[PDB]
Ligand binder design. Sequence first.
Ligand code: ADP
Ligand code: ADP
Ligand code: MG
Ligand code: MG
Lengths: 7, 7, 90, 371, 371
Amino acid sequence: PAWXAXC
Amino acid sequence: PAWXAXC
Amino acid sequence: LKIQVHYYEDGNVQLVSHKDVQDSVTVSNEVQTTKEFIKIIESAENEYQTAISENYQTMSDTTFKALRRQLPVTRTKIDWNKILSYKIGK
Amino acid sequence: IAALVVDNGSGMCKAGFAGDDAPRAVFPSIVGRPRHQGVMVGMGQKDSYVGDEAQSKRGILTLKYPIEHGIVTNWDDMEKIWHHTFYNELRVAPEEHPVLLTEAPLNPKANREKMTQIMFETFNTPAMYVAIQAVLSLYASGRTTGIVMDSGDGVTHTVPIYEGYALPHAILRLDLAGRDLTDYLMKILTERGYSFTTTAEREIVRDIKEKLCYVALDFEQEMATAASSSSLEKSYELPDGQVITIGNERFRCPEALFQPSFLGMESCGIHETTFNSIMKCDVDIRKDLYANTVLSGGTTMYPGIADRMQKEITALAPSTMKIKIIAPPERKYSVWIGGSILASLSTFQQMWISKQEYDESGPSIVHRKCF
Amino acid sequence: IAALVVDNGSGMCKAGFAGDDAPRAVFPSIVGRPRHQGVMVGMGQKDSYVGDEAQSKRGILTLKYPIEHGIVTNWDDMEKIWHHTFYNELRVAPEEHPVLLTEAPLNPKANREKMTQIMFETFNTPAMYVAIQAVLSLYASGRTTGIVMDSGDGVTHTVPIYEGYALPHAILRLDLAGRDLTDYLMKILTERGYSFTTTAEREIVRDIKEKLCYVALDFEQEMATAASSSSLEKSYELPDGQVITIGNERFRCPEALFQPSFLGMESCGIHETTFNSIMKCDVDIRKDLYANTVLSGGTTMYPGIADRMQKEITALAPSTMKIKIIAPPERKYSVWIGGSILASLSTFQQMWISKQEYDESGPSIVHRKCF
Ligand SMILES: Nc1ncnc2c1ncn2[C@@H]1O[C@H](COP(=O)(O)OP(=O)(O)O)[C@@H](O)[C@H]1O
Ligand SMILES: Nc1ncnc2c1ncn2[C@@H]1O[C@H](COP(=O)(O)OP(=O)(O)O)[C@@H](O)[C@H]1O
Ligand SMILES: [Mg+2]
Ligand SMILES: [Mg+2]
């Protein structure tokens, strides 16, 4: 969730 | 890591 | 020009050869014709020896191989089990 | 009775009966287990899903590939793949039909031993053979003289095979394969902030690779275009619905097959290993190989890889050669198809090791026929 | 001023001043370049490394040999090997001492010019000579007649030296050597599941070859013993601490020297090329040779190799010719030793090409000799 997709 | 001494 | 060699220490091998030469020249002086004929003999014999050593040490290996090979197309010694059993595809 | 043919590929298992023109069973070679405690006991869960089951239930499972670079790393996982192959995917009793196993070249003696032992003693197969995958690849095009460049999820290999006899000393293996290109695809997607870490996420990246990557013909000019216009870049949407843009990365991933330095592998690229295997072949036969470079296995499916292989190996060959890259459709499952072809034949009907032979002579029969 | 003696071997460069019975410098002839980026700029890191510096730094470098098979491949790399030899390995200015270069018989004539031009014009040697390696070997072995079987990393050379002369017509250059032998060890290790690919990894294998491997006096008898009992099995652990377990492989690798078939090599084996050389001689000197078989260069060190060579070449010769194998210790270095003796002769001290002679005649000094 910090990254774009993914986390 | 597959390989016994290498991958 | 002709060459003949025979070897027979245990088995026998023989070398037999010819070369035929035709040429055209111009006549000038006694010294110059002397030199020129010799230059031709020199050139012809040295090229004939050069081919018969340098080409035959390599190219004859390749043509003799094309008559019978030293190792197969596989570069391996053949295996009797697979050779008996496997009539490999056309 | 019809023999059973199984392609033990590192990423996907292709299998069927002998004489089928295409495999019946085609599934990812995955064994799964649950990542969390089960709480709705009335569901009646099972402890390890396999194949398309594991791929259906993806995000509640850890996903194990039991085969790494052709080496079977986990045997009880692989034994479950074969159990599912036989009783469920093909629906057959493997003790009642002969079995054909594919295997990768230059793979250790113990792998064949344990494959043999499991077939002859877990599954009690009645007769069996283990084929060098590239043989089957060449046979699948109906030709009988060439060099195969196989490139699966786990192994890339070059095998010269002339009048149907292999050249064993002239074989090459390069472990840079489809999984490794999936790995590098992760890393480069991370540049645009698209992180992927879980095995499940790995499978997403595999899917992405399989539909937006392509082999650039001309890397330098391409990458100069990619730094000049957005027109080369496009998009895909996750199982989570959100869109992801694949760009410079599209070509950069598959470029690695030609430049293994990009994954820090000093090993030569696929054009160099093909060349370097042709140049291991006897000087007479090299011409016959250049007209007969056959590609096989799923990572040979990248668009333009044939064009690139040609335009590259062109430079490695001398001028005045018919450098022709044999890249047909069905190269996908070619290895298996070749298996089915060869399995149908009375000459090959001599080759199959009888269970009784192995039973009496122990591993000493296979220790020969592996060469 | 004392002379400097240099052995331009394929694998290791042996160097030192004359009269000495052991070289002062012995190092692997490697130019090693970065595999990766030098991020810690404070290191003072080098554009390339050489010798023991490259072998310490093995894990981060692409190791290139400048000599392959037996010919220089890239002159500037060899030039770096020489520069390092003088300034770093020996800590001397090459302008200040006479210099001897070893050379191989039948190396093409242009190589002699390149070496000569580099040694005078790059390195300013005050005098120079270039010598046939094999001669130095017998010379070092004291004897004034015999057949040499010299094998290092690149070429196996057989020369019958008679009345102190190489007989050029009988010289059998064989392309099988240590490096080639190293490759085959890689494969037979692969059988048992150990892998090695990078050029760094090649040098690890070289360390193994120099320790566990040996020559069995009769192949299938030994192998049958090894197949029966694990008693013949030994181990050696990599830099990463894991032991390798090895039996059957130990005799199997150097068997290749007697069986070039194992590697698909069309050329004859080491005893064979020796016999095949002997037979070419002026017949009267045949018995002069058979009592005088002389082994040298690093590949000649394997345990049991002399005893095997005797039982082997005894088959090829007509019996009662009294074939004897000269193979004491120190035969690792006979070639360089020979030069050290040659360079001690006062007559040789007259015979060098002087710097002033090259500074008047240029590379044309060799054209009287090369025909
Ligand atoms: N359209 C495609 N483009 C590029 N690669 C593909 C494509 N389809 C499949 N692949 C690759 O093929 C590989 C597996 O191919 P296959 O040989 O059938 O299985 P295995 O390698 O296990 O034998 C996978 O790693 C996958 O990445
Ligand atoms: N004790 C040993 N056991 C096995 N191989 C050896 C041994 N000593 C040297 N060698 C081999 O000899 C080769 C080089 O031989 P040498 O003649 O010293 O080098 P060069 O021919 O380059 O001068 C090396 O590749 C090495 O593997
Ligand atoms: Mg495959
Ligand atoms: Mg040497």
